């Protein structure tokens, strides 16, 4: 239709660039959290045993990852 064919072509390549970036975040989020738990465990049973500082640095990471997820829907 020369006017629909242009919108259908951009609609298909949108979901590609969208679902590719979607999986790009969901597997990078899981690989970033994996290294935070492994760092919380390898520092759990050194001295200090900071059951709060490890519980606080865990919250600090979750809040820091929380603001990342919020900006994914607030496109300028």
């Amino acid at each position: 239709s020369n006017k629909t064919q242009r919108v259908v072509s951009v609609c298909k390549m949108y979901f590609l660039e969208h679902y590719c970036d979607m999986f790009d975040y969901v597997i990078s989020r899981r690989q970033r959290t994996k290294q935070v738990l492994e760092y919380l465990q390898q520092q759990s049973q050194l001295p200090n045993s900071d059951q709060i500082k490890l519980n606080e640095e865990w919250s600090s990471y979750l809040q820091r990852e929380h603001q990342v997820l919020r900006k994914r829907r607030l496109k300028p």
Partner: protein, 173 residues
């Protein structure tokens, strides 16, 4: 063998549930606009003067008695109503300092997902043969199959909200 791919719908460990729904609620709003936006001229007030899935289902719109409107006017009013929810920072806070209201899921997420699913119902029941001639059944099924898995993951839509596509959605889960 095991279970699914876009099972990315699972909540990331240690994060807010209202945010994981709100971000996806905005995302499916964008995906549905891309699907209907490509067949925007195959769905006109002459083609579909009544917002309907199959002749048993009809969705009215209130501006307050709900009136019968055409399919493109119902979608145009639905999406303009969704943007009124997002721009309302008391519901969808854009500042990282703001928080969600009480019952953000039952009062905001579920009412929006109930309406947005109806565009899926109209495309399948009245424009699937036209979607089939556009190589969009792949994009349509993927966007719809992701919509149902996300709603099933958090129990957001009751079976009555899947009205006409309730039989079609049974070949999942």
């Amino acid at each position: 063998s095991e279970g699914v791919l876009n099972q990315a719908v699972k909540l990331p460990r240690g994060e807010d549930e209202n945010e994981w729904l709100a971000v996806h609620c905005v995302d499916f709003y964008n995906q549905i606009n891309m699907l209907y936006g490509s067949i925007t001229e195959f769905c006109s007030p002459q083609t579909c003067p009544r917002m309907i899935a199959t002749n048993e289902y009809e969705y009215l719109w209130a501006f307050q008695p709900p009136v019968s409107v055409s399919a493109p006017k119902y979608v145009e009013c639905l999406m303009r109503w969704c943007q009124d929810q997002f721009d309302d920072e008391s519901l969808f806070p854009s500042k990282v300092t703001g928080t969600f209201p009480e019952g953000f899921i039952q009062r905001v997420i579920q009412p929006i997902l109930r309406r947005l699913f109806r565009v899926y119902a109209h495309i399948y029941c009245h424009h699937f043969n036209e979607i089939l001639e556009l190589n969009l059944q792949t994009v349509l099924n993927t966007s719809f199959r992701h919509f149902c898995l996300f709603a099933q993951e958090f129990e957001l839509l009751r079976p009555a909200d899947f009205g006409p596509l309730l039989e079609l959605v049974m070949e999942l889960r």
